[PDB]
């Protein structure tokens, strides 16, 4: 009994659908895109052209909702990369010492991740994916949503899809503001922090011996410097490839051409390591760019009126500058927040509002982490009432940098920093007396003076051909 309609069948839509089918009799997923039968790019998820990191915090939730998915990804060529043992990272504060594993991430093409999650989700016969379908309107009124009116793209026929619960997971281009406007509801407060970040990506075939057991490599901006922030990330993915994504804020955006890409990876960022490694590899694709990098949040949970049976989650409610890599994990946390309110409240009145408030809490750490680091770049454009961003940003950055600095050279501080940065723990965890204690104890290793690559890692950058 009871039925749910999910708008958007991307990451949040698939995750929330898998959860919902354990609580309602049927789930219908409505998407305007066409869906490939295999792990291919598609127009509805254009960000899949760029490096995607699935931090442990999100990965564990994906596993809970769709168990066996992590192993299926690894079996398809995804990499499990330990953090910080599997990363060579020139942070704002210097090189990260590669301490033993504290957290992890899963590294693969977003196309493969999306295909795997969708295939696992649709194993549940009571979830149906309705492709090539437009979302026209929410049915019902401002007091209660009762479904959606859709248009079939092939036939042009419009029809009404009844639902006890509608979940908007249509992503960064969600039309929910319009949909809610047509209901008569007031417009939500919108908050944004826009650093002008632009991403540029190329795929490379790695040297054959480095197709496995190769680290994540990153060169980060120094957000404390009053200069445009530029970054470079090299990430292993399936089938012996490296995805390389460079980025820059206003005044340091990467160029669009193949040659400028390589020079940006060498000279536009603070250390040339990513430039040096891609020179060992074979380029497979030309530069793809994205500017879908604004931190944008819609405070739907604070609206004066909220209709029963409507919930918005994923990028549709809060989307981030992706250099921090939180979007998919934040959506996963938001799904568990809805599940928690469903378990407590079932379908009583109050459910949708309670879930919307719970979702706002679930994305808040990801929101604070991304905006607090973006707000310092030259030229940043903002619209906010958040005192964390307007006033208390000065000391929040003073304590962030003490922890960030000490995390590069102290195993206990690093463990706590990466627990938070992978969304495996909340921000209160940093106020644990033991963590503040380790911070005060400071570095236990020297600061590396060169990239902390292993000899065996660099040895696999050449074939050894040409030698008798
Ligand atoms: C360049 C870039 C890099 C990123 N890197 C990372 C990273 O490293 N780690 C990470 O965790 N996140 C990353 N992200 C964020 C991540 O892509 C998103 O957070 C994630 O896709 C959110 O899922 P979603 O389901 O809300 O949206 P999406 O996955 O985009 O899915 C939206 C779905 O809704 C459909 N749709 C859209 N509009 C409509 C409509 N009007 N009607 C019907 N259907 C509609 C689309 O076709 C699609 O199927 C990155 C994003 C970008 C842009
Ligand atoms: Cl994009």
Find residue 387's DSSP bridge partners: none
Among residues 122, 119, 103, 123, the alpha carbon closest in space to that of 111 is found at 119
Quick one: which ligand is closest to 327's CA?
Answer: 1
C-beta of residue 281 within 8 angstroms of C-beta of residue 211: no
CA atoms lying within 13 Å on the CB side of residue 302: 11
Quick one: which ligand is closest to 315's CA?
Answer: 1
Among residues 133, 144, 183, the alpha carbon closest in space to that of 29 is found at 133
* Domain 3-44+111-188+293-369 coded CATH 3.40.190.170: no
Residues whose CB is less than 8 angstroms from the CB of residue 328 and which lie 6 or more positions away in sequence, other chains included:
11, 52, 54, 58, 113
CA of 401 to the centre of ligand 1 (A): 30
H helices present in 66-197, as ranges: 69-75, 110-122, 176-183
**Could you give the strand order of the β-sheet that contains 127-130, starting from the edge strand earlier in sequence?**
127-130, 26-30, 3-7, 165-168, 310-312
CA atoms lying within 13 Å on the CB side of residue 202: 26
CATH class of 83-102+198-290+391-463: alpha beta
- 382 in ligand 1 pocket by Cβ < 6 Å? no
Question: Which atom of ligand 1 is nearest to 8's Cα?
Answer: 34
- 7 in ligand 1 pocket by Cβ < 6 Å? yes
Among residues 114, 127, 136, the alpha carbon closest in space to that of 44 is found at 114
Distance CA 390, CA 448 (A): 35
Coil, helix or strand at residue 425: coil
CA of 464 to the centre of ligand 1 (A): 42
- 321 in ligand 1 pocket by Cβ < 6 Å? no
Q: Which one-letter DSSP state was computed for residue 386? A: -
Q: What is the DSSP string of 340-384?
A: HHHHHHTTSTTHHHHHHHHHHHHTHHHHHHHHHHHTTSTT-EEE-
CA of 121 to the centre of ligand 1 (A): 17
Pairing of strands 295-298, 318-319: antiparallel
Coil, helix or strand at residue 194: strand
Q: Which two tokens stand for residue 460?
A: 């696999």
Q: Which two tokens stand for residue 448?
A: 């590396």
CA of 225 to the centre of ligand 1 (A): 31
Question: Which atom of ligand 1 is nearest to 329's Cα?
Answer: 11
- 20 in ligand 1 pocket by Cβ < 6 Å? no
H helices present in 378-445, as ranges: 387-390, 393-407, 411-421, 433-441
Question: Which atom of ligand 1 is nearest to 45's Cα?
Answer: 30
Residues whose CB is less than 8 angstroms from the CB of residue 466 and which lie 6 or more positions away in sequence, other chains included:
none
Distance CA 85, CA 308 (A): 47
Residues whose CB is less than 8 angstroms from the CB of residue 182 and which lie 6 or more positions away in sequence, other chains included:
137, 138
Find residue 26's DSSP bridge partners: 3
Q: What are the residue ranges of CATH 3.50.50.60 in the chain?
A: 3-44+111-188+293-369
Q: What are the residue ranges of CATH 3.30.9 in the chain?
A: 83-102+198-290+391-463
CA of 49 to the centre of ligand 2 (A): 7
Find residue 407's DSSP bridge partners: none
Distance CA 361, CA 379 (A): 29
Distance CA 262, CA 143 (A): 55
Among residues 391, 381, 392, 384, the alpha carbon closest in space to that of 367 is found at 384
- 57 in ligand 1 pocket by Cβ < 6 Å? no
Question: Which atom of ligand 1 is nearest to 319's Cα?
Answer: 19
Angle at 370 between CA 260 and CA 237, to 5 degrees: 55
Quick one: which ligand is closest to 118's CA?
Answer: 1
Residue 367 CB burial class (10 angstroms; 0-12, 13-18, ≥19): buried
* Angle of the 110-122 helix axis to the 11-20 helix axis, nearest 10: 20
Among residues 204, 194, 195, the alpha carbon closest in space to that of 287 is found at 204
Tallying the residues shown for the chain, one arrives at 468
- 131 in ligand 1 pocket by Cβ < 6 Å? no
Question: What method did the depositors use to determine the structure?
Answer: X-ray
Angle at 44 between CA 119 and CA 248, to 5 degrees: 115
- 12 in ligand 1 pocket by Cβ < 6 Å? yes
**Could you give the strand order of the β-sheet that contains 103-107, starting from the edge strand earlier in sequence?**
53-55, 103-107, 79-83
- 169 in ligand 1 pocket by Cβ < 6 Å? yes
Resolution in A: 1.9
Residue that is written with structure tokens 């042009």 in the block: 156
CA of 42 to the centre of ligand 1 (A): 11
CA of 45 to the centre of ligand 1 (A): 6
C-beta of residue 328 within 8 angstroms of C-beta of residue 58: yes
């Amino acid at each position: 009994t009871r039925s749910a309609v999910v708008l958007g069948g991307g990451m949040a839509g698939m995750l929330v659908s898998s959860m919902l089918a354990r609580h309602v009799g049927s789930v219908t997923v409505i998407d305007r895109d066409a869906f490939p039968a295999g792990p291919d790019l598609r127009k509805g998820v254009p960000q899949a052209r760029h490096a995607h990191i699935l931090w442990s915090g999100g990965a564990r939730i994906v596993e809970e909702l769709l168990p066996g998915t992590t192993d299926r990804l690894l079996g398809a060529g995804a990499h499990r990369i330990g953090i910080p043992d599997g990363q060579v990272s020139y942070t704002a504060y210097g090189w990260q010492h590669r301490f033993p594993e504290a957290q992890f991430m899963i590294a693969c093409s977003r196309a493969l991740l999306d295909w795997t999650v969708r295939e696992e989700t649709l194993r549940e016969e009571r979830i149906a994916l309705v492709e090539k379908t437009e979302v026209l309107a929410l049915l019902g009124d401002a007091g209660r949503v009762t479904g959606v009116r859709v248009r079939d793209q092939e036939s042009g026929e419009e029809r009404e899809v009844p639902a006890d619960l509608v979940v908007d997971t249509t992503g960064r281009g969600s039309p929910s503001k319009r949909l809610l406007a047509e209901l008569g509801l007031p417009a939500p407060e919108e908050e944004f922090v826009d650093s002008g970040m632009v991403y540029a990506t190329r795929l490379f075939r790695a040297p054959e011996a480095a197709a496995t057991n190769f680290p994540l490599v990153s060169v980060h901006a120094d957000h404390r410097a009053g200069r445009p922030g530029c970054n470079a990330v090299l990430m292993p993915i399936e089938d012996g490839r490296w995805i390389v994504t460079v980025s820059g804020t206003r005044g340091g955006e990467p160029p669009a051409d193949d040659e400028g890409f390589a020079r940006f990876a060498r000279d536009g960022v603070r250390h040339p390591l990513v430039g040096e490694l891609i020179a060992k590899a074979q380029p497979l694709t030309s530069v793809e760019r994205s500017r879908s990098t604004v931190n944008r949040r819609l405070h739907y949970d604070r609206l004066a009126t909220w209709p029963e049976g409507l919930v918005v989650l994923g990028d549709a409610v809060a989307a981030f500058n992706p250099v921090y890599g939180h979007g998919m994990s934040a959506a996963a946390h938001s799904v568990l927040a809805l599940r928690s309110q469903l378990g407590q409240r079932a379908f009583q009145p109050g459910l949708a509002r309670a879930a919307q408030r719970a979702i706002a809490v679930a994305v808040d750490d990801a929101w604070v982490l991304a905006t607090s680091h973006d707000i310092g770049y030259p030229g940043c454009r903002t619209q906010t009432r958040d005192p964390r961003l307007t006033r208390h940003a000065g000391e929040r950055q003073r304590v962030t940098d003490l922890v960030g600095l000490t995390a590069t050279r102290n195993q206990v501080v690093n463990r706590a920093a990466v627990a938070l940065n992978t969304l495996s723990a909340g921000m209160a965890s940093m106020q644990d007396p033991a963590v503040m204690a380790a911070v005060r104890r400071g570095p236990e290793v020297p600061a590396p003076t060169e990239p902390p690559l292993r000899p065996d890692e660099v040895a696999r950058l050449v074939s050894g051909a040409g030698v008798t």
